[PDB]
Amino acid sequence: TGAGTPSQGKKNTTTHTKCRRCGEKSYHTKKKVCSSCGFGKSAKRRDYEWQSKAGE
Amino acid sequence: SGRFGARYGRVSRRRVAEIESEMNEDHACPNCGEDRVDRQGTGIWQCSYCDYKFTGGSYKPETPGGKTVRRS
């Protein structure tokens, strides 16, 4: 079975959903962790310096 | 070992035969003396006559070493 089109048919699982804290559709309902703001993982807000150019 | 057809070879199924042959013989119950003991699973035997359920070998109700304990 091909990894392409034929294997896309089996995709009906829900994972990432609207997040209670930030509003983004990034709350992984299986992990109960938001990949965008860190809700479920951190009291602090997910943030990284690499999300921008080093001198900005 | 006839269920094994022409597969596996002599020894493997020759032993399965002797082993299962001695395994299914009617065994003399330790409780009463009737030859009515049948295996219920691995190392588990039971008498259909008096219902005495007991432990023994995996394929025989008594093993050489088992019979030794009695002596000493």
């Binding site: - | 032993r15 409780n31 190392g43 023994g56 070998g57 995996s58 394929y59 093993t63 000493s72």
Partner: protein
Amino acid sequence: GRRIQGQRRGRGTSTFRAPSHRYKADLEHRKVEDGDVIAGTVVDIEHDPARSAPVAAVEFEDGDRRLILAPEGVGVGDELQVGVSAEIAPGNTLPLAEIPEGVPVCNVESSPGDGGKFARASGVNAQLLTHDRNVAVVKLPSGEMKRLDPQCRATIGVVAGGGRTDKPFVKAGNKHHKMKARGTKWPNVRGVAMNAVDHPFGGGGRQHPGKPKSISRNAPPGRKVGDIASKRTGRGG
């Protein structure tokens, strides 16, 4: 390279773990205040998923219902005893001191009260040889002369299920089912059959180990494979 299989094991992932949630009981000698008065009745015989051997259910006088490492010859109804003054019959537990020399013993403790460590597998048995006020010499199933505290409890008789090893598996499917009841990854791919990146014996136009197989005791994990610190090899001499 990549971590060899022996190193994946250690991480304790599902594939290498034992089906514990499926295991029955931790067959340990009961704890008796003292006196030995403790006795019970064998209520049933069962299959132990973890040892492929039968195990006996016992109802003790004081109400306790516990599974027991059953020796050969124990049947429903029989009465078992645990204590310093327990009779000397198969299926009974007492310290190596109270046991007469020359008697087959099983489920021997390593240190008084641990609950039993030695001789617990199918049809095996320890042999109580010498006594003393300080040391109890027991011959273990491996043939080794072990020196134990005479206070170490044990059960009289050999373990049930003897001869299990006598019958061949005949087919891969039979191994398969047993393995699925143990903490073991099976089947096994030979080291020499893998790529050089996956094992010290991997690689080569044809299959053969790269170096000699006898590895040193000091080799690090990932390299300690083949014949570990072999004192010798082969059958010759």
